[PDB]
Amino acid sequence: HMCDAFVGTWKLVSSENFDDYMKEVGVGFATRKVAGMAKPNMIISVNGDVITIKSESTFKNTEISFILGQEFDEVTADDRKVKSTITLDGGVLVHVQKWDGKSTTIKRKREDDKLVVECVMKGVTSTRVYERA
Ligand SMILES: CC1=CC(=O)NS(=O)(=O)N1Cc1ccc(Cl)c(Cl)c1
Incomplete structure (x- = not known):
């Protein structure tokens, strides 16, 4: 029952500062433009x-499929x-990615009827809000 309130199908309804997050991560121009358009x-x-997410x-x-705490x-x-x-x-799912000596963290939180995704790279945060599909 650890993740019951996360289970389901969620649709992106708003994004803030995702372009900047992607820049900070090192994503190139054309991928940023196409990726930023997506409504996953x-x-x-x-x-x-x-x-499984x-x-x-x-x-x-x-x-991705995973067990909590297991890389x-x-x-x-x-x-x-x-x-x-x-x-x-x-009660927050905390997803850390390590590569090339860098690190980024994606947090997924249930807030009201939304699932809020916060993506952080160094000093840059992007907030993406999902609602039930
Ligand atoms: C971080 C993140 C949050 C989300 O809510 N949806 S998403 O856009 O699929 N995503 C992964 C991602 C997609 C595209 C790129 Cl270019 C990067 Cl860096 C990451």
Whole structure:
């Protein structure tokens, strides 16, 4: 029951500062433009200890499955090869990606009827708000 309130299909309804976040991460111009246009659906499911998060968009479909606290290798939508660990901290899913001596953190939180995604790279934060599909 660890992630019950996250489970479901979620659609992006607003974004702030995502271009800047992508710049800070090192994403190039053409990928930023196409990726920034996307309105993904985020599909979260749980089977036993295994959490699966899919992102489906016109840019790039991704899928990760993981156990909390157990590092895994992830190829991101922008084609970074990262080492990821996802933990629950006070009811927030905290997803850390490490690559090339860099780190970024994506937090997913349930707030009211929304799922709020906060993406941080150094001093740059992007906030993306999803609603149930
Ligand atoms: C971080 C993030 C938040 C989200 O809510 N949806 S998303 O856009 O698929 N995404 C992954 C991502 C997509 C594209 C790029 Cl270019 C980068 Cl760096 C990351």
